[PDB]
Design a binder for this molecule. Structure first.
Ligand SMILES: [Cl-]
Ligand SMILES: [Cl-]
Lengths: 641, 641
């Protein structure tokens, strides 16, 4: 008999000639051919064979099976043997073996190189955690792709994951078969596989899910380079598997058959967002022909903070403040490479040009993410997200922090199912839903800010209208009720921005303003509870920041004076919006209050003088920034979501 | 001051009057108002207040917080109090409390009744396993729905899950608020909530995701009845949450605000498929005007097995064998109720009538599942599924077995992404992909069958052409080479079914038939390996069944003689297709062989005489059956997928 299978029925008469793929086990039926007078048996194998008898003689039970496996490939056909000798009160059975290797290997232990997997079945599984395993694939974020044969540079080839195919066996056995490297039609739309000729040929991708390789000689060693196309999403878990099938070429009436298949599994790394507690590397600035105020002060602050400034062009096809509202700096990481990128959720239709590519420093990626709602003040954009610092909550670690999404509480505007599903599909920053649709912009950054400390490693700052009323009341009692909110601002600057200079006395007697702020205070308190619960915070982690709001067009909250919470956080250097509060002998009481709260904790407060920038209405153009920061040192794959 | 929040800043001057929702905690800032001369303090609360000072006097630290909570609702406003007395080398601060209850409760401990949850935050989580928690919801499978105010019978109301809402507090506090029972727009499409007036009003559902309730008096107690619409799928995880928001009615210029929200989570039970090792309860039979053969023998076998027979009408709008190929008996289970149902994946377009409803015994549900591919021999149907018995594999338990799906191995036909995703979304029967597209029907039941034993509790039978060649060779050597395959069958019965009577000598000399069977044997061996690996089977669990195949129109395998593996499994009673093998002195050697293999294990073999039924071509009409069985005793929620 001639065979390629997991079960072999030995025959006293004809010895079996079989193929053994290395890493697999064959079950040997020893008793089916045994003579009736046989009571016991002995079994012996050659050097490359490992025989297991239920883990020397053995009693002959009703079923008697032995398992065999091979340790190295055969240098010729039938070079290995297993012999069974039947003892009674009488027969021999023989199996000739030829061992071949057919294996696909990846960086399964996440060490930065392809390593041989210890087990053919364990290698199809992807296990999270430090005691886990499973290779990682990175999405191609090359900004050129935004809007068959390719040249790939040594700088770009490190982004790709290796997948090695090894086949070893006698030439006369291997020539009977063909190899097919493949994946399912659906998985092929999610990644590309390249083969170097440097010049690389596309062997698998969205239009090709099977690739044939000829077996010429006694060994084939080929390395393929793989890249993902998309991050995990509602429709995509992140898992992609590749297989090599050994196909027996046929007689035209009998179809071909697959005799063996080896499979590897990749997990496409998630898109990870970065909180403002991470060290700034670069500050991207969309100036919109501005210099004095925001642009100059933020340029100065950035130099003071060991950070680069990258100019950003205006995009005439987008609403103003797009650099902040439609984009986020994030990263994606593999054992062999970390790719920082900007994730863009454009609100405009049919875009042709992408001016943000001029600013992107070498190696910085660019990815687009679709959304559904594109109106002014839409919360369906990546700007409607804030990242917490790393926290432990109820004994559960969130080493990369948790993503915070602005949402609604009235049973209004919201993030689309598409963008929300994309976020939850990343897994490693378990999203928390906050309440922000009471704010005109819908952005939580108008009432909260995390700042790093040199303990949890951070403090949460929260907007507090009650704290501001308390501060103004104390000043009034001290005889400063005549001090003026919006002092040192030009009358037309106030009028053109919907504001009016008011004394502390007029502000404290304004019952409508007080009711607007009481409403805002209730909305912030709802969020304070969710943040304490979901981030494991205690009140010692929170600092109240005096901040007034007003309701504009139900109506929505807007900062009354420039929002102190809208900080540019650069380590210990804080770029705080200059609020223009009531002055008490040449000093703004709001600047003095916030400096008294933050300076003793090691913070350097720089007040950004730019009233028009901070009072810009939603949709209107203004200078803005987006800071690119150091990715977390904690490796995402070692987390157990 | 007047408040409803998680943080209260005490004031030496004005005492605070606050609302405390039961089950929540308030943080009290004790140090912010403390006099400069104060060095230590004492705190005292009344009977309903629980005070925690970092878990009698206490030192006055820079931040000094105390947490308070309430144990029962207040019978009047300010009926509870907390007093802080400041000691120096000097002041008092007071908080008046009013406790209210606002809670949604479900059968969170899966005990069959609504129980009070121990924690407001833990109740939003759904944890798998015996030490888990989380209420369960059942899909409405009423066959009437196949194709605002409702009457629900005491028999049908047990299918629904209870959700109780309790609100308790002073009438003068509760009258300030409104209650809103709600869920997101997307979740509302997945379930219906009813309120009894018995006659039940639909309060939440696909067209209504918010329902308002008036707070009249000092307490509200309402029970709602919930039912799911759909099983988990590609787009639906199975989790649905409901909330009650306490809304403060507004001054028209200030929008309303939500002061508190309580939330419960349900998991819609998965659709669980049943293996043929479970005890038969009812046999559904589509006779198609037939009596002698299949219909009579299966009716007899069913009576012999303590099972009911339910006649099924012919469906002229569907391909033949639809009762078996387009339907599956499955179940869905909650702590309070188990619903057995038939899951239908119709292959026809625009169906109006559903004759299977006439057969459905009282209480048996009916659900439809969409598919994409509707051609003849399509593997995109629920008939392309077999369920394994419960198994343990590599230390992992599959107490409900694993679903087995027929698929392809040539890198052909396949299950659609829609049906496959529906199956994997159930979670509790971790699907295994087998190779069956080499078979004309694409059904794994043509080469494998599980039978229960009175140890794993089962045996796997596998089709084996090699075993059949071996049996025929032994008969030839004994002088019976003249024995005839298809003996005792009429010549026209053979001709009209594409077969011809052949002696054992002619069969063993047929080289084309041998090559067709060698091909089939390689395909079955691929599946034997996957089954051993994925189900943790050893060769002692497998019995080879002699069975020949032939290739017909690449070409596809069909059973050559009636397929012995296509058994009607009724406990120890097996309805085996009568194969009409070569007879050796009045006995079919195939019947004798299978009886020698199965009878010593306690099986009673009944050979179903019906050649035309077992040789029916795909798409053609024939009598067939579908057996409804006992659901597993193991509760699905106690598994950790
Ligand atoms: Cl996953
Ligand atoms: Cl889930």
């Amino acid at each position: 008999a001639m065979e390629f299978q997991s079960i072999i029925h030995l025959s006293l008469d004809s010895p079996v000639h079989a193929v053994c793929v290395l890493g697999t086990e064959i079950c040997l039926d020893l008793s089916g051919c045994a003579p009736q007078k046989c009571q016991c048996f002995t079994i012996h194998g050659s050097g490359r064979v490992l025989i297991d008898v239920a883990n020397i003689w053995w009693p002959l039970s009703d079923p008697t099976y032995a398992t065999v496996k091979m340790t190295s490939p055969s240098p010729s056909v039938d070079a290995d043997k297993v012999s069974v000798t039947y003892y009674g009160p009488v027969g021999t059975a023989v199996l000739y073996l030829t061992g071949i290797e057919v294996s696909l290997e990846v960086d399964i232990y996440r060490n930065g190189q392809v390593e041989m997997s210890s087990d053919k079945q364990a290698k199809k599984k992807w296990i999270w955690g430090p005691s886990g395993w499973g290779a990682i694939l990175l999405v191609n974020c090359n900004p050129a792709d935004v809007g068959t044969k390719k040249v790939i540079f040594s700088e770009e080839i490190t982004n790709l994951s290796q997948m090695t195919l090894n086949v070893q066996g006698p030439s006369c056995i291997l020539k009977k078969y063909r190899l097919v490297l493949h994946t399912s039609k659906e998985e092929s739309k999610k990644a590309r596989v390249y083969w170097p000729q440097s010049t690389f040929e596309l062997v698998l991708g969205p239009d090709q899910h099977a690739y044939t390789l000829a077996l010429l000689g006694n060994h084939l060693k080929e390395t393929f380079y793989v890249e993902a196309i998309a991050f995990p999403s509602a429709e995509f878990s992140g898992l992609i598997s590749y297989s090599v099938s050994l196909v027996e070429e046929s007689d035209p009436s009998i179809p071909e058959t697959v005799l063996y298949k080896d499979t590897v599994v990749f997990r496409v790394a998630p898109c990870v967002f970065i909180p403002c507690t991470q060290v700034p590397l670069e500050v991207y600035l969309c100036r919109e022909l501005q210099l004095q105020g925001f642009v100059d002060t933020v340029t100065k602050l950035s130099e003071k903070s060991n950070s680069q400034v990258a100019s950003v062009y205006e995009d005439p096809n987008r609403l103003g403040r797009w650099l902040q509202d439609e984009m986020a700096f994030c990263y994606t990481q593999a054992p062999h490479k970390t790719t920082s990128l900007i994730l863009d959720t454009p609100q405009a239709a049919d875009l042709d040009e992408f001016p943000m590519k001029y600013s992107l420093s070498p190696g910085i990626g660019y990815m687009i993410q679709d959304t559904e709602d594109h109106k002014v003040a839409s919360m369906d954009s990546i700007g409607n997200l804030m990242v917490s610092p790393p926290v432990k909550v109820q004994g559960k670690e969130y080493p990369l922090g948790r993503v915070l999404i602005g949402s609604s509480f009235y049973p209004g505007r919201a993030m689309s199912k598409t963008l929300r599903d994309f976020l939850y599909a990343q897994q490693v920053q378990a999203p928390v839903e906050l309440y922000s649709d009471w704010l005109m912009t819908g952005h939580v950054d108008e009432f909260m800010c995390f700042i790093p400390t040199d303990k949890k490693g951070f403090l949460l700052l929260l907007a507090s209208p009650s704290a501001c009323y308390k501060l103004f009341r104390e000043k009034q009692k001290e005889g400063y009720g005549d001090a003026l909110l919006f002092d040192e601002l030009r009358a037309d600057q106030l009028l053109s921005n919907g504001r009016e200079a008011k004394t502390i006395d007029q502000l404290l007697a304004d019952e409508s303003l007080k009711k607007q702020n009481e409403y805002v205070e209730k909305c912030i308190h709802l969020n304070r509870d969710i943040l304490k619960t979901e981030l494991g915070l205690v009140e010692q982690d929170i600092i109240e920041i005096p901040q007034l709001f007003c309701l504009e067009k139900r109506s929505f909250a807007r900062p009354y004076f420039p929002d102190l919470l809208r900080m540019i956080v650069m380590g210990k250097n804080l770029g705080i919006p200059k609020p223009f509060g009531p002055q008490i002998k040449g000093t703004c009481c709001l600047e003095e209050k916030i400096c008294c709260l933050l300076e003793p904790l090691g913070f350097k407060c720089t007040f950004i003088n730019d009233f028009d920038c901070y009072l810009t209405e939603v949709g209107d153009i203004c200078a803005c920034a987006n800071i690119r920061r150091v990715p977390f040192a904690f490796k995402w794959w070692k987390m157990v979501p």
